[model samples]
Target: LVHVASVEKGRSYEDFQKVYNAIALKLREDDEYDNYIGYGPVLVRLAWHISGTWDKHDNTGGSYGGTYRFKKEFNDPSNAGLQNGFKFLEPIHKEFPWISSGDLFSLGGVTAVQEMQGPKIPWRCGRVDTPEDTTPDNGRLPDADKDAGYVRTFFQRLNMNDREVVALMGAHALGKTHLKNSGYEGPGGAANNVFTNEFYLNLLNEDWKLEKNDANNEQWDSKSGYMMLPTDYSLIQDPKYLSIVKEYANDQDKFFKDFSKAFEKLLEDGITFPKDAPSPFIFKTLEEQGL
Candidate 1:
């Protein structure tokens, strides 16, 4: 019963695909943010942070309410660097003024993940916007400065298991920690803009030196000029996360499959999907259509 509602009447796959094309093109053009790494990673992070607010037991929060477009949610310190993602999407929002904010934000993440070599996250529509009063309180987002136990405890409130948590953190493998954004700096993998298993590989292979960036935040650095938050590095530092990281790192197909499933679940955290609902619609990438 998680289906809130379907796309606007008369809308078809091609219509949604146009929005995908808009987002993808903007993502390609907005290449100056975060020192030229582009909007791909932050778009995924924006979707994660917005959806991460869900409380499954109460069916509140999540991407179903795209309140991040509001000033209060945008000003949240936890969302410091995300303004870039929002800015990147602003033009597209202006062009496709009819798309719901909730839908646009979530689909932006899906498109970014797919374009950046992540996974094909099937998404749904019907995320109607709400008043400012509906915005979730600040401090609901995870802190990069925290630990495994803290990360585990935080996701529990949102009903994400340890496996989902581990899969979600694979996102860090895509973007870097911006000193101005999160008080940490340096890319997480060999190429910050591209998604890969390099995060796990670097974690396993590098001699990580716990050092403070110019922002004075602690992160693990290696000879390759890449870095991970103390909390991100903890995934492999701990035994349980180490095993899962190894699994994803060793098998790209399995990682893509798991990441797609877990991410879709994360986006749909608290909503009710009826037993009679249709299977998730696999949105096509711009390239897939020869666009």
Candidate 2:
């Protein structure tokens, strides 16, 4: 079945901008969550995990469905620790109930990334919610306990190439894996809230040793207080992925540009925008507004 964007009535960039501003303000105000890492990282992750379920082959799961609001999708094993982001968005949804779940979710990531000084993610709306029966199964998300080949192959289901996969993984810099949530622990770097190319730098520079977390999951750990999933370290293990990783680490601007494109594409996956639909909206950052 073909899914189309159903634009919210009489809404345009300004309407979404209001929503963006609300999310941004909350990011600044919610300082106590996750040791002051704030709600930014989880917001990005929530947006991502929502979009990540898409299967380019059948168009079964994607941000377009917004099935994440349903219990099955919300309770997916892969979605542990994301409830915080959902709760954070609850007030905004109550305030602007017209916005579709997919739009709000994908937009939350865009807002958080920009508010955290990451990159400008152009966004589009009109993803209407699908029935709970349409929710994809749990294992569609990538497995942390894997290698370069698995990482490469898994993203293929989402139609992402090595470069796109590498660029998207750079987002790991923003959040830590909770031991209770994903059987992994620790932040990726000092500037976890600030988006940068630190994920690649930490991967290439850190002396990571293969070890087990308390739950006996194998993950790459470093004494510098960082951890990389086998999937994360796979970037350097593969020559092609390593080259892109180094490039992103060495040049922040290139990383930002590529990441912005891939992220927008990820959010837009599985939905066909009408020919006359408005161009993607580029919301202004809080700094841009001088707020």
- Name model 1 segments beyond 4 Å from true: 1-3, 274-278
TM-score of 2: 0.98
* Quality of model 2 by C-alpha lDDT: 0.90
How many angstroms is residue 85 displaced in model 2 relative to the true structure, after the best TM-score fit? Answer: 0.7
Clashes by residue pair, model 1: 1-272, 1-273, 1-274, 2-272, 2-273
lDDT of 1 by residue, 1-291 (tens): 242744555666677888988998878777787678888988998898899878766666788768998888889998898887888788888998878888888888899998897778898666777778888889777787878888788889887787777777888887777667767777877677777767777788888888877877787888888887878887876788889988988987787788888898888776665555555678777788787
Top of the candidates by TM-score: 2
Instruction: List ranges where model 2 is wrong by over 4 Å.
Output: none
Residue range 1-291, candidate 2, lDDT tens digits: 699888999998899999999999888888889887889999999999999999988889989988899988889989999999999999999999999899999999999999888878889888998887988888788888889999888889989998999999999999798989988888888899998999999998899998988989998889897888888988998999999999998999999999999999999989999988989999999889988
**How high is the lDDT of residue 254 in model 1?**
81
Candidate 1 is scored at a TM of 0.93
